[PDB]
Design a protein around this ligand. Structure first.
Ligand SMILES: Cc1cc2nc3c(=O)[nH]c(=O)nc-3n(C[C@H](O)[C@H](O)[C@H](O)COP(=O)(O)OP(=O)(O)OC[C@H]3O[C@@H](n4cnc5c(N)ncnc54)[C@H](O)[C@@H]3O)c2cc1C
Ligand SMILES: NC(=O)c1ccc[n+]([C@@H]2O[C@H](COP(=O)([O-])OP(=O)(O)OC[C@H]3O[C@@H](n4cnc5c(N)ncnc54)[C@H](O)[C@@H]3O)[C@@H](O)[C@H]2O)c1
Ligand SMILES: COc1ccc(CO)cc1
Ligand SMILES: COc1ccc(CO)cc1
Ligand SMILES: [Mg+2]
Lengths: 1213, 107, 54
């Protein structure tokens, strides 16, 4: 058996001094980065004046010669939406290959009227891109109804002439501006004109982010074929005068990442070498483009091997991009310059600012990292660029600097920095095709500055160029935007960033409007911190901490208030390798479980008397302890629960966030009148063995309740460690007792007489057993024992033909197979619109086969084991039933090493109907169904019809589809254009409805209120909206003479928070919404007319319909209802026939309540959140029925960066 | 339609244009249920007309109109209310229902 | 444009014929001007050959 973590994440090579200096700068505070850059970028006053004069001259020439789309908009008086819609139409018309066929469709069909009749795919799929072209603004989703109206309007107003102009404009832009040509041969033909003027070219075949082996092979052969064409055309001109190629490493391997570094070196490197050998033979440049920040250092390992490879010697065409917006840039340059010296290769170094700025900000915030790997003020990037240019210009004997910029100030500064001694081959400038030529036509040539410029020339079809055109077009801080803004003076454009930064009060301060990841929530609480698994220092330190964690003697014992108790002891084995003993658990006898509840009951007053602020301080101290102990906690979670390192980090972060969130919610709400329930039994699942465990216990404790913590039998060790941390943080032993063991221990705790509440997260079937146990029980006040039961899902994602396949596949692979599908939120049913289903399925299967399944103590493992052999057997029985029915089943092949553990390969099962699924299958099993677009509403019904309602995803660019689907789906956590596994505490408050939960949501503001006898008013919890049926009922009550009930009804209408609609603070590039809706149909079990009126008021005020128990005999109390109220009212003689219900209100004495609670628990389907009150309580207490539990929380997380950029961050420079 | 509003001119021609800004992303849910019912019974042309009406309806439009500072001037499209339907044929009734339901009305 | 330039004269007629104060006569003429310009602009935004008159 291999030692745990002995091969966790070894670096490709030992890190040299120069490499270590790169890693050390990865997230260096911005105030530390800038001073040396300012120093290196400083030039003499004479140079700065000459640079400003040159920049002004260039800018004056630019503004003096400065429209195609603008001219079209002007000529036809188009609104912006009309312009966008026209270009979308033109794009669609250009998908018709034959010109005569297109023109006939235009003249005879499109112009004459209904364009919709002649053009499965919305015309407006790419409207966000065309919106950027027309308006300069990015909108993440497309208002397809506005665009359709605008297209109809413009065609009916202007006819064929405007369509013709739009088609011709789109053809020119997509064929000649956004690309140099559609094919390398066309691009080469079009390059002769500017080559004759002194420009050169680097061709970009536009490949990027391979998702499958086949994609990577396609991009390879595209690069190889382009190299031949470019090399034939170069015809011996060499690497400086002649054209070259640019490649992206992500195009050449589907798993280009540090986590897969061994595959990258073994599989990607030979492909680059083969392309480089061909470039060498033709003597052309081959440049490696720079991508995301977490790929920088990995790419250096390839650059190192290639430059040291003797087979490539004699050729100086290898090139490499460095991004000056990155904090590591000067250190990367030091490394490259030294590599060039060692290898004797004159590396072509393209200095750029960087293309992924918005995404880098979002990623660092999502990952909770210490700082950004890029600057946050645009001027810092400018200074970085100029400083790095000074470094490169001192090294022209050993590297060939290539200054890629469209900024005339940047250009002029470097032109003068480089001085008057010039020869071709010393350095060059670079620019983008169809963007930089106006500037560089003022640079290239003896009559200008006599400096060469290489044009970066995209080559590809319409489909290829549109894929990432949004990123290429992206902002208010951009020079090209500012040059076209008449409000920006030339003096502003020639401002010297070096001197501006030098004079700032704090040199290098972070942008004021960009939150560090730790500060995402501002004053409310400190965000949990993650770990950067692309940072070699982090990987090396984590390796040691993980190894050290595997040497610890982890145990879990029955920790009663009186001390550890004896019991049956057994080992805890790693699910990925049963030979790896992780620790030992001593399980709780049912007698000691009952004893623990009695001890908790005796201890309840002493814990309730700890003021809420001090209880919250215990939670905050526990969060600090968990944060500090994260590396050790990761190792335990990895080995005990089959989690990968990434998933263990998320697990610990979630626990920290629960602690800090419930602490803050406590400080916002809890006072002397919110008395604790008493002893709370917290029963938790194995699959989030620290986060959910900690969340339930922390909430119960901070609400003033002593806790009996019963962790899942599979994962007691991390639970014991969480309890140890909470106790260290100040939770007394009497307030927090750990009771390891199986469901018998949970059941014994639930049945214990002093148990005052139950928090259960687990399977729906077990929750139903607990519901049955509790139906026997009443509190000493004669009321139901509160149960929070957060249960399973049958989670769907709907994908339409406007979604980007690569994005869908990434989110599907993550949502379905992360943690081997052992997340309650995991994607179970992918629903693909028929027109795109085959393409997406092919890509998905290709991506599936790139996953590494194995024991999770290796960073390269993507999918770990299932938790037990029983879980494996259950999942495999489902897979085989499906296979036996003829369903197509795609499965990864498992390595022989998996035999020592319990693994199920990620599996894709193609289904006929959603009804082919019965219950949740908690494993790595994705089901795929196809749907026709017109059946989308029926499909949403089918998703709802399972009775589950946990997570739901939708991938579409179309606002109409978003509005339709999100208004009709019934699930607690919705996700738009992203994965469906988000449960970021306080950002996506998590929890579902139906068979998926009773609520309230964990990680949301209603949670703590369920754990006290009188619920506080949560922060932000109110609504100005009044349910109109409630209002009609109140008027009906007054007309009946029920004056006090009418007043109570009006009060309920005001007190209801139905209609609350909030945006929760979170990361950039996402909108996280939280809304309160009706629950559905509430079962009313009244005893008296006044009780019925109060129950109906409560239910109607919260937007619900009702089914009233017909056995109450109260039919005559509801005569002559207004039709609006009658529509919401039904009478039920057989409650089981008239469900599912979404809650219940009960009136009666204690024994009536007990009997009704038993009858309600017997109803099929979802657990019902029941509220009961006596008739006297209804008379005495206006809040006898709490409106908090009569609404349903919905969280929706929208990825607003999905179109390729962040609109809001375009204004942050 | 309202004088001084964007629907007015369309009443004065025999085929109404699509007014500026006249659209809505919202689809009436009863319209949606009606279209599913039509498809269930095989009325394919009518179900298509129903879906098309659901999309072209501007019910739910909710705009702020440009005006003076210190004022918010809002313009919204709601259902008319209850529409009297006087059909002659089954298909005609289905088309009338589609139009009325798509615009949020009862009939 | 003509109503705008002739507003003072039009005001005088409205004041005397319809019993309006000067401020409300101004509002009357402004509203007429705005109708003219609004329906002109709405026309430029919408009307094409297939929108035949009644
Ligand atoms: C020929 C060529 C090849 C290129 N190849 C690559 C490549 O392989 N990889 C890559 O990542 N980029 C590459 N780029 C650069 C990238 O695509 C942009 O074109 C470039 O960053 C724009 O810089 P500028 O001098 O043209 O414009 P400017 O207007 O001077 O600078 C804009 C840049 O400033 C930066 N920026 C904007 N806001 C902020 C902020 N708030 N804080 C910090 N920085 C900010 C960004 O880098 C932004 O792109 C290339 C550019 C060219 C011209
Ligand atoms: N809605 C959510 O937030 C959420 C979160 C995580 C997991 N889940 C669900 O949890 C399930 C997986 O976790 P699991 O396998 O540990 O679930 P489970 O239902 O098997 O076990 C959950 C817990 O209940 C205990 N238990 C078992 N039988 C009991 C009984 N008769 N009485 C009292 N307690 C009993 C177990 O010991 C364990 O502690 C999945 O169905 C998943 O969807 C839901
Ligand atoms: C548009 O200029 C770019 C060239 C290459 C890259 C590689 O990421 C990005 C931008
Ligand atoms: C609708 O035309 C109007 C003209 C003037 C006023 C102000 O009196 C109001 C309306
Ligand atoms: Mg179980």
């Amino acid at each position: 058996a291999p030692a745990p973590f002995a091969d966790f994440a070894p670096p490709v090579r030992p890190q040299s001094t120069l490499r270590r200096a790169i890693t050390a700068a990865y997230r260096r505070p911005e105030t530390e980065c800038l001073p040396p850059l300012v120093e290196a970028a400083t030039q003499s006053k004479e140079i700065r004046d000459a640079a400003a004069s040159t920049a002004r001259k260039l800018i004056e020439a630019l503004r003096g010669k400065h429209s195609g789309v603008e001219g079209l908009v002007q000529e036809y008086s188009l609104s912006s939406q009309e312009g966008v819609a026209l270009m979308c139409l033109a794009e669609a018309l250009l998908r018709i290959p034959d010109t005569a066929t297109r023109d006939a469709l235009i003249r005879d069909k499109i112009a004459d009227g209904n364009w919709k009749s002649h053009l499965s795919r919305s015309l407006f799929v790419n409207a966000a891109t065309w919106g950027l072209v027309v308006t300069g603004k990015l909108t993440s989703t497309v208002n397809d109804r506005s665009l359709a109206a605008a297209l109809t309007r413009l065609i009916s107003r202007c006819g064929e002439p405007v369509i013709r102009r739009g088609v011709d404009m789109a053809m020119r832009m997509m064929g000649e501006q956004f690309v140099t040509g559609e094919t390398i041969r066309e691009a080469l033909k079009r390059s002769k004109e500017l080559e004759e003027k002194g420009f050169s070219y680097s061709y970009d075949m536009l490949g990027e982010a391979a998702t499958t082996a086949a994609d990577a092979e396609r991009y390879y052969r595209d690069y190889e074929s382009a190299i031949h064409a470019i090399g034939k055309a170069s015809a011996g001109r060499g690497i400086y005068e002649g054209p070259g190629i640019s490649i992206k490493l992500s195009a050449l391997h589907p798993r280009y990442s540090r986590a897969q570094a061994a595959r990258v070196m073994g599989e990607l490197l030979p492909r680059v070498k083969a392309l480089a050998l061909l470039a060498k033979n033709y003597d052309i440049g081959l440049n490696i483009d720079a991508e995301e920040a977490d790929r920088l250092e990995l790419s250096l390992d390839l650059l190192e091997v290639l430059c040291l490879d003797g087979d490539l010697s004699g050729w100086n065409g290898m090139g490499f991009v460095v991004q000056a917006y990155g904090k590591r840039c000067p250190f990367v340059l030091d490394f490259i310059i030294d590599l060039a010296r060692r290898s004797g290769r004159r590396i072509m170094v393209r200095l750029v600012k960087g293309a992924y700025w918005d995404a880098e900000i979002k990623r660092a915030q999502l990952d909770g990292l210490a700082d950004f790997p890029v600057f946050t003020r645009k001027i810092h990037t400018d200074v970085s660029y100029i400083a790095c240019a000074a470094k490169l210009l001192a090294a022209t004997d050993v590297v060939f600097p290539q200054f890629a910029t469209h900024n005339a100030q940047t250009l002029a500064a470097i032109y003068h920095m480089a001085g008057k001694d010039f020869h071709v081959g010393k350095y060059e400038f670079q620019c983008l095709h169809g963007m930089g030529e106006p500037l560089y036509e003022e640079v290239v040539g003896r009559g200008k500055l006599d400096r060469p410029c290489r044009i970066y020339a995209p080559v590809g079809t319409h489909e290829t160029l549109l894929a990432y055109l949004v990123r290429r077009l992206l902002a208010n801080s951009s020079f090209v935007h500012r040059i076209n803004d008449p409000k920006v003076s030339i003096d502003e454009l020639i401002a010297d960033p070096v001197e501006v930064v030098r004079a700032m009060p704090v040199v290098g301060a972070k942008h004021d409007r960009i939150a560090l990841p730790a500060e995402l929530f501002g004053d409310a609480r400190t965000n949990s911190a993650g770990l950067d698994l692309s940072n070699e220092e982090t990987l090396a330190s984590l390796t040691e901490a993980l190894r050290e964690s595997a040497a610890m003697k982890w145990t879990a014992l029955p920790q009663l208030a009186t001390g550890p108790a004896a019991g049956e002891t057994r080992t805890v084995l790693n699910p990925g390798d049963h030979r790896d003993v992780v620790g030992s658990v001593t399980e709780t006898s049912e007698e000691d479980a009952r004893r623990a509840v009695r001890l908790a009951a005796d201890a309840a007053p002493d814990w309730a008397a700890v003021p809420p602020s001090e209880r919250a301080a215990c939670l905050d101290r526990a969060a600090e302890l968990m944060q500090a102990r994260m590396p050790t906690l990761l190792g335990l979670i990895i080995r005990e629960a089959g989690k990968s390192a990434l998933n263990a980090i998320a697990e610990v972060r979630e626990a920290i966030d629960f602690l800090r969130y419930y602490a803050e919610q406590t400080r916002r709400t809890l006072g002397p009148g919110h008395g604790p329930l008493g002893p709370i039994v917290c029963i938790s699942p194995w699959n989030f063995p620290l986060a959910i465990f900690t969340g339930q216990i922390a909430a119960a404790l901070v609400a003033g309740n002593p806790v009996l913590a019963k962790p899942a039998e599979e994962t007691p060790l991390i639970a014991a460690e969480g309890v140890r941390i909470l106790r260290e943080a100040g939770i007394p032993a009497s307030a927090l007792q750990l009771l390891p063991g199986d469901g018998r221990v949970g059941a014994a705790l639930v049945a214990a007489a002093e148990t005052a509440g139950v928090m259960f997260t687990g399977s729906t079937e077990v929750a139903r057993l607990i519901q049955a146990q509790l139906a026997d029980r009443l509190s000493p006040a004669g009321r139901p024992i509160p149960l929070i039961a957060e249960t399973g899902g049958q989670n769907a994602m709907i994908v339409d033909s406007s979604a980007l396949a690569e994005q869908v596949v990434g989110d599907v692979i993550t949502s379905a197979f992360d943690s081997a599908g052992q997340r309650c939120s995991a994607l179970r049913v992918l629903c693909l619109q028929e027109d795109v289903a085959d393409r997406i399925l092919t890509m998905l299967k290709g991506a599936l086969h790139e996953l590494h399944i194995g024991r999770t103590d290796r960073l390269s493992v993507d999918v770990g084991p299932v938790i037990t052999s029983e879980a494996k057997d259950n999942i495999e029985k489902h897979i085989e039933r499906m296979r036996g029915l003829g369903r197509k089943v795609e499965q990864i092949g498992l390595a022989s090493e998996t035999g020592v553990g319990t693994f199920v390969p990620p599996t894709i099962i193609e289904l006929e109907k959603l009804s082919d699924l019965q219950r949740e299958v908690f494993g790595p099993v994705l089901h795929v169904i196809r749907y026709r677009r017109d059946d989308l509403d029926r499909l949403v019904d089918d998703v709802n019809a399972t009775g589950y309602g946990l997570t739901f995803g939708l991938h579409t660019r179309l606002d109409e589809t978003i509005a339709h689907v999100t208004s009709r789906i019934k699930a607690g956590n919705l996700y738009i254009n992203r994965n469906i596994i988000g449960a970021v505490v306080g950002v996506q408050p998590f929890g579902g409805r139906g068979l998926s939960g009773t609520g309230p949501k964990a990680g949301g503001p209603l949670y703590l209120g369920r754990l006290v006898t009188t619920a506080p008013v949560p922060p932000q919890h109110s609504s100005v909206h009044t349910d109109p049926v409630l209002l009609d009922f109140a008027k009906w009550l007054d007309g009946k003479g029920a004056r006090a009930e009418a007043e109570a009804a009006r009060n309920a209408g005001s007190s209801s928070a139905l209609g609350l609609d909030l945006e929760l603070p979170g990361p950039v590039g996402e909108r996280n919404l939280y809304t309160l809706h009706a629950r559905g149909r509430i079962l009313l079990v009244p005893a008296t007319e006044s009780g019925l009126y109060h129950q109906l008021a409560a239910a109607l005020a919260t937007g619900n319909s009702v089914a009233i128990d017909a056995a109450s005999g109260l039919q005559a109390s509801l005569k002559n209802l207004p039709q609006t109220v009658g529509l919401r009212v039904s009478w039920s003689k057989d409650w089981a026939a008239d469900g599912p219900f979404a809650g219940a209100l009960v009136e009666g004495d204690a024994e009536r309540i007990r009997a009704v609670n038993k009858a309600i628990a017997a109803l099929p389907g979802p657990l019902l959140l029941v509220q009961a009150a006596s008739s006297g309580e209804i008379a005495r207490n206006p809040d006898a029925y709490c409106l908090n539990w009569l609404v349903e929380e919905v969280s929706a997380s929208i990825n607003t960066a999905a179109a390729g950029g962040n609109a809001s961050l375009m204004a942050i420079g």
